[PDB]
Structures are given as C-alpha cells and as structure tokens.
Write a protein that binds this ligand. Structure first.
Ligand SMILES: *CC(=O)[C@H](Cc1ccccc1)NS(=O)(=O)c1ccc(C)cc1
Ligand SMILES: *CC(=O)[C@H](Cc1ccccc1)NS(=O)(=O)c1ccc(C)cc1
Lengths: 146, 93, 93, 146
C-alpha cells in the first residue's frame, strides 16, 4: 500500500473501551472527611459524555479503599483485546498522589500500576486515560487580573 | 523491541500539583463541567491534547470562587495535563 | 477578570515521576537528543504538544540501556509532558 | 474584521524570547555527586536548536544553588514585554521536584515561582516553558516486549 504513518492511536477496534467512573460522596466519620455535595452531577455528566463517545460506562458509588483496589485489579484482568482504549475517572477527596476511598486513602500509583504495559497485556500499546477530580494539596491560587 | 511499562498513560488532573480542586454543589466540579463541555463540542473535531488545552482555558478563565470566608474567596484554578502518550489520540476514525 | 498564577506553564520532563533519567556520555541524554531532533524536524509544522508526543514515542521506542550491571541493564524511559497551557503553541506564525 | 478565534498563543512579538540553558556537569565533592559526562553535547544541541527557532539563548555552566536562584530571579525581573515566550532548560542531577546546583539542591517550585503570572507581569498570558533533563527518583522501567 501507500506510505503508512503511525502518528495516531488505532481507535477503530470493535469497542472504544471501558469508562470506569468512581464517584465517592459519603465518607466514614473516622476519616474526618466531609461529604462532597454535587458530585452526582459530575457522575451523570461523565456517563452521558462518554456514552456518546461510545464507551462502555460503568458507574460505581461510595467505594471503600479496598473496593477501589479490588475493582481496578479485576478490570485490569479483563480481556481488552477488542477495545481501543481504557478510561477511568476518579471523583473524590484527595492529596498529592492520593485519591480517597470512603474509609481511607488509595495511592494513585497502586491503581495505575495494574494497567502497566507489562501487567495488562491486552492494553499494551493502547491509551490508558485517568481523569482525576480531587485535590492535590491545600494550596489556593490567588490569580492575577488581566 | 520493548516499550516502557509507563508509556501510553494520560493523566488529566483537575488541578496543578499541590493545589486545591474546586467544585460547585449545584453545577458540579469546575474541571468536570469543562471537560464534558469540551468533549461534547470537540471530540469529533480535535486531537485529545488540544481538547484538554481548551479545558485548561475554560477552567482558568470562566471560574472563580466566591466565599464568605476570605481565605477561600476569589480563588482560581488551572488543570494539569500529564501525558506519557506516544501517539495522537482522536476519539473518531 | 483574572487568570490563575500557575496558568501558561509547560513542563517538559525527561522522565516519568519517580523515575531515573538516562543519558549517553557520547550522544547526550535520550530526552534532549530526541527533543532537539523533533524540534528541528517539526517546529515549522506541528503544534508543540504534538511535537512533544513525537519526542515521547522516540524516547520510548528507540532507546534502551546497556550496562554490565544487571541492575541498570535493558531499561526503558518515557518522558512526561505536563501542561498548564491555555492555548495551542506554534513556534511559527 | 472577520471572526476572531484566540486558540493559539500570539507568537509574533518582536522577539520569540529568552532560552536560558543551565548545564551542570561538575559537582562539589561534599554533595557526593558524580560528574555528568556528555552533558555538553546536550547544551550545544539545545543552543543550536533554539537559535534556529529565533530564541535569544543564554548558556550557563556549573551554577551553584545560590547562582541558579539569583539567575532566575534576575531573569524574571527583566522586561519581557516584547517577547512572545520564555524557555528555561535545566540539565543536572535531580530528584522528584528538585534540580541540583553544583553545591546543593534547588526546589523546582522556587525557580518557577519567579515566573508566576502575578510575579512576572511582562510574561503574564505568555507561555513559560521549562524543559527538565534530570532524574525524578530512582525507579527503573523494565519495559515490556511488543
Ligand atoms: C480539597 C480536599 O479534598 C481537602 C478536603 C478534605 C479531604 C479529605 C478529608 C477532609 C477534607 N482539602 S485540602 O485543603 O486539600 C486538605 C485538608 C485536610 C488535609 C488533612 C489534607 C488536605
Ligand atoms: C539519576 C540521578 O540523577 C541520580 C544520580 C545522583 C544524583 C545526585 C547525586 C548523586 C547521584 N540517581 S538516583 O537513582 O535517582 C538517586 C541516587 C541517590 C540519591 C540520594 C537520590 C536519587
């Protein structure tokens, strides 16, 4: 055939892939964490948005740190051979490098490691997107008038 | 013959490293509101990094906090695109 | 009426967070070699994020360490693009 | 005039801007740091590459942590009104969030803070590019065969 340039990911697999949305609104009292009002708005917006992009959306609500890890592990063990990509959206409280389960923290590295090129072979060479809506610290940006 | 195990990951953070991430109890978080709006408008037109750049501009220019607490009043936010991707990404083909 | 003080910054890291960054005593670092090569070839043709994506692919696919020390042998590297930019960037006009 | 879309940075100012290259090869014995052989190759490659992009290149070699901070401060105090952007390239040893001067560390945040939109007004709204060639930790990527 003619000149072939591989500058863009192959996104014409039978399926676009999974879109896992973890929406944590209520946190255990002992964590001292307050609720995240309005987060359901985000969850619904994301579900519709990715549905229109043809992603197989799976919404999960109020997952403990143990459930988040179990979920990610199980998802990374699925056969993604016929999927073009993978998307995971995390909506919760957080700190730099950490996302919170309803009962405690989960290191983002622990979550993403399940999808490393050597640990999830059916996603090797395919885009793995992690969308994170959570604080990464306490700093506030005062901005500057333009 | 090999590729990095960390390659082909894209992390779309709602805020810069070390920073607070803003949300509106009624309209949702600033970042997700903007991300969904830009995907709806540009997913069949622009490469993903360019869509996320539009998200950065939308969050940076159209949002500002309002609080009775001076500590959290009139604050701004800039999302943070972290790409380890090796190719351009289009949601369409 | 305001923009974030952290807006309009782009950090082109040679490697992923927490990782080692490789260099060749003769040809220079893997990242800078690749960055300069891609800028020379694409600066008058592609938007900056797309140039950096080519850099990511070049470093990820064309380089691998060789060491007599098994600990540092056959290792790979993926650069890390961190963008807080609010617009597309072209070096030409 | 016709429809105006501001999707790209204005890069037609009289000057493209400065390109500061800090090349640290030799480190003080007390730091326990070894030399970075071949780094001059990078410095020269960058100088030529950015020269062709019309940037005003300034190469600096073996700067102490004090000199790096002084340099960044002074540069951020210049009048960049007629410049389209700013570029800073750091070549040295490093750790996550840290770049090394010949005699000690410099937090990357300290360097970039001088250029915040509220601290360097002549660069507000203009792209500020930091290119970092330095380790961000000790981890090694074993890769995966494709
Ligand atoms: C922005 C954010 O999520 C937190 C709010 C929070 C999160 C978890 C539990 C309680 C409250 N704010 S923060 O200013 O980033 C922060 C507050 C408290 C700690 C211990 C760390 C960070
Ligand atoms: C990759 C890198 O720059 C360092 C080498 C180094 C840097 C400064 C001083 C001595 C040696 N390697 S590292 O594995 O990332 C590392 C080595 C030693 C410490 C204390 C931190 C990180």
């Amino acid at each position: 055939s003619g000149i072939s340039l591989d500058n863009s990911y192959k996104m014409d697999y039978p399926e676009m892939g999974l879109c896992i949305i973890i929406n944590n609104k209520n946190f255990h009292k002992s964590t001292g964490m307050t609720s995240r009002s309005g987060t359901d708005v985000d969850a619904a917006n994301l579900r519709e948005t990715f549905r229109n992009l043809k992603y197989e959306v799976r919404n999960k609500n109020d997952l403990t740190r143990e459930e988040i890890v179990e979920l990610m592990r199980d998802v990374s063990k699925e056969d993604h051979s016929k999927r073009s990509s993978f998307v995971c959206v995390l909506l919760s409280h957080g700190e730099e490098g950490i996302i919170f389960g309803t009962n405690g923290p989960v290191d983002l590295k622990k979550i993403t490691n399940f999808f490393r090129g050597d640990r999830c072979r059916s996603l090797t060479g395919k885009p793995k997107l992690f969308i994170i809506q959570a604080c990464r610290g306490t700093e506030l940006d005062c901005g500057i008038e333009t | 013959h090999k590729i990095p195990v960390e390659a082909d990951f894209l992390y779309a953070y709602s805020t810069a490293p070390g920073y607070y991430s803003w949300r509106n109890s009624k309209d949702g978080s600033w970042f997700i509101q903007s991300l969904c709006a830009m995907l709806k408008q540009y997913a069949d037109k622009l490469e993903f990094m360019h869509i996320l750049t539009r998200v950065n501009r939308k969050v940076a220019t159209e949002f500002e906090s309002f609080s009775f607490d001076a500590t959290f009043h009139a604050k701004k936010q800039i999302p943070c695109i972290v790409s380890m991707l090796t190719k351009e990404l289009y949601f369409y083909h």
